[PDB]
Structure formats: structure tokens, C-alpha cells
Amino acid sequence: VIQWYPGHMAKAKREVSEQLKKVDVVFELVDARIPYSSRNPMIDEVINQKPRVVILNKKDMSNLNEMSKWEQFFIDKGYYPVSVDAKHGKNLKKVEAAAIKATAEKFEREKAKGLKPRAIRAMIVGIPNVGKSTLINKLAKRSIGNKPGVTKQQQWIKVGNALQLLDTPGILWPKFEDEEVGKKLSLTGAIKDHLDEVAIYGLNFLIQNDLARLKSHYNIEVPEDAEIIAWFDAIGKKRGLIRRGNEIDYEAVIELIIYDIRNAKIGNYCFDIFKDMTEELANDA
């Protein structure tokens, strides 16, 4: 867990801008389950119009259709979005490809100014737990100081044919200010720090978006006019999470729901629903 505090935030912003000076293209890594909510709130300030590949990681845990709506969003902003599964090695060569496309104009201008062709230089930036070290390791085909006194120095990794990748990610902070965004971040395991309200949010999401699947997963049936407590009760009763007679063990039920959602045990969802976020988008623009 990264402890954020104002000083550490300033140090992170400063350091990431410094790293960005060294590169032609930046890979902004986001969670495919929340392509918009898993972004740093000042990411655009930090990146400052640098050619950008947006990588929607953990696509194996998300909804492709909703993802494709976010990809359209990133395209409309002039970025180059791709989706990958960094852990299981799915769709990876598309990264270099995207970088080539994102820097094409820059290198045409370089070529016209007489310069030789060279390797594209890149780095990865994003909030914690979105898969940055996983992706670096997978691109490097190795596990990226050893002695206690000794600090790691940053190095380039040769990736694919024409790509040089900084071996150290830029780590920035998650969105803090909106309560719903906080619940989404908690539901994806992006942050881990009110759990009952997180479980309520996750339940309501599933009721509204995949009701039959939720029912099938816990093998329950719940009155459509019931309040959310009845879903907690149905789940607790069916799985026998019981306390002091036949009272429902709510903290156990809450924990089970959060686990099942975080680990894609019920289904593969994108919690950022594009059509529902139009106002927040209007605000951020």
C-alpha cells in the first residue's frame, strides 16, 4: 500500500514528469474494468500532449462491449487504445504496434529534418495495482537494488524489434474526491482500505446489469420489491453464513460479495458505464 500524503504526491508528479522527458511515447495503463475511474486525476497535466497509448489491462476480467465504448472515448481524444491481458500474455505485440502508430508523425518530421531512424523510447505510467510491473515483466520476458544499502538505477529494456522501454514505471495516485469512484476502486481491488457500502454498490450494480447471473451464482431468488438487505439475507442463508442461532453473519456476507466481485467469480464486468457517466465526462472536459 502506497501511503499518499501531499509531499509524496508532489514528489511523484515531479519524478514522473522527469521520466517523461526521456521518452517519445507514454503508455498510460488503466484497468479495463474501470478504464476511466482507474486513471490519475492529473494524468493529462503530467503527460502534457506526449504521444499516448492507453492500455486497458486485465481485459480478461472485463466486458468487451463496454470497453469498446471507452476505447472510442480515448480515440476521440487522440490517443491510441489497446486492450491486453498482461498476466496471461494475451494480445501483447499490439503494444509496440500502437507505439509505432502513436509516434509516426513525430518520426516523419524527424526524417524530414534529416535525422536517422532510431528506436522508439517508452515508459508506463498509472495508478497502483493496474498491472504495471506485470506488463513490464511480460514485455521484458524476465523479472525486473539487491543489496540493502543499494538503490536500483533505471534502465532501458529492449522490447520487440524497435522498442526501448523504461524498466521502471511512473506511479501516480488514484482519484480521491468522488465517493462512487472510491467504491469502484474498492470493488476492483485497486485500493483496499466503508465495506458494507461497497458491497451494496456492487450488489446494486449486478442487480441492474446482470441479475440472472447474480441469481445463478448464489443460487438464490429474491423479491423484486425487496430492499438490498434481503439480498444480503438471501446470500447469507443460502451459504449458511450464520451467527448466534440463525442470525445472518453480515460481515462474512459482505466479505464474500466483495471477494466474488474483485475476483470475477460472478462475471466479467466493466463498472464504468459510459452512458451513465456523461455528466462526469462533461465536467472533466
Ligand SMILES: Nc1nc2c(ncn2[C@@H]2O[C@H](COP(=O)(O)OP(=O)(O)O)[C@@H](OP(=O)(O)OP(=O)(O)O)[C@H]2O)c(=O)[nH]1
Ligand atoms: N487477471 C489479470 N490480472 C492481472 C493482469 N495484470 C496484472 N494483473 C494482476 O494485478 C495485480 C497487480 O499487478 P501489478 O503488476 O503488481 O500492478 P502495479 O505494478 O501497477 O502496482 C497482480 O496480482 P496480485 O495482487 O499481486 O496477485 P494475484 O491476483 O495475481 O494472485 C497481477 O497479477 C491481467 O492482465 N489480468
